[PDB]
């Protein structure tokens, strides 16, 4: 599914990401644009060979098992495939654990490289609040 911007803003708020660990809702919406262009089915290979999955692009080396990544820890106890669904819950439960892993949202290179230091409110500007 390719969420609409406000559709995705609305869903992430439902699961309690607005201001989670101090990161405003727009930082999450901003992360989800640039990680995946808003698409729950998104999958991209990383050079270590790991793969990034879904809306936020949760990585198989730590976070999820895909069966082809040596040394995977499956720190969300989950199949990476389940994070491609239309029901963003597993991705949120996992993202809450990543962000809580100390480096915060800097765990997402597109957040660091593109969201951080910006007015992340443009990402929810027009959302019915």
52 an active-site residue? yes
Picked from Cl ion, Na ion, none, the partner binding residue 74 (CB below 5 to 8 A depending on kind) is: Na ion
Among 7, 52, 66, 119, the one annotated catalytic: 52
- 104 in contact with Cl ion (CB under 5 A): yes
101 assigned binding-site residue: yes
Environment class of 36 (CB within 10 Å of its CB; exposed 0-12, middle 13-18, buried 19+): buried
> Which tokens is 74 given?
């499956």
Largest CA distance in the chain: 44
35 an active-site residue? yes
Report the alpha-carbon distance of residue 32 to residue 24 in Å, rounded.
13
Instruction: Mark the binding-site residues, compressed into ranges.
Output: 101
Known binding residues for substrate are 101
Q: Which residues are catalytic?
A: 35, 52
List interacting residues with Na ion (CB under 5 A).
72-74
């Amino acid at each position: 599914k390719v969420f609409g911007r406000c559709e995705l803003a609305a869903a992430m708020k439902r699961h309690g990401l607005d201001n989670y660990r101090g990161y405003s809702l727009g930082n999450w919406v901003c992360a989800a644009k640039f990680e995946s262009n808003f698409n729950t089915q998104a999958t991209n290979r990383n050079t270590d060979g790991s793969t990034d999955y879904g809306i936020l692009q949760i990585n198989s080396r730590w976070w999820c098992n895909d069966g082809r990544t040596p040394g995977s820890r499956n720190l969300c106890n989950i199949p990476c495939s389940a994070l491609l669904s239309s029901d963003i819950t597993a991705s949120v439960n996992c993202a809450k654990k990543i962000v809580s892993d100390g480096n915060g949202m800097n765990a997402w290179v597109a957040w660091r490289n593109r969201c951080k230091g910006t007015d992340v409110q443009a990402w929810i500007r027009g959302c019915r609040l």
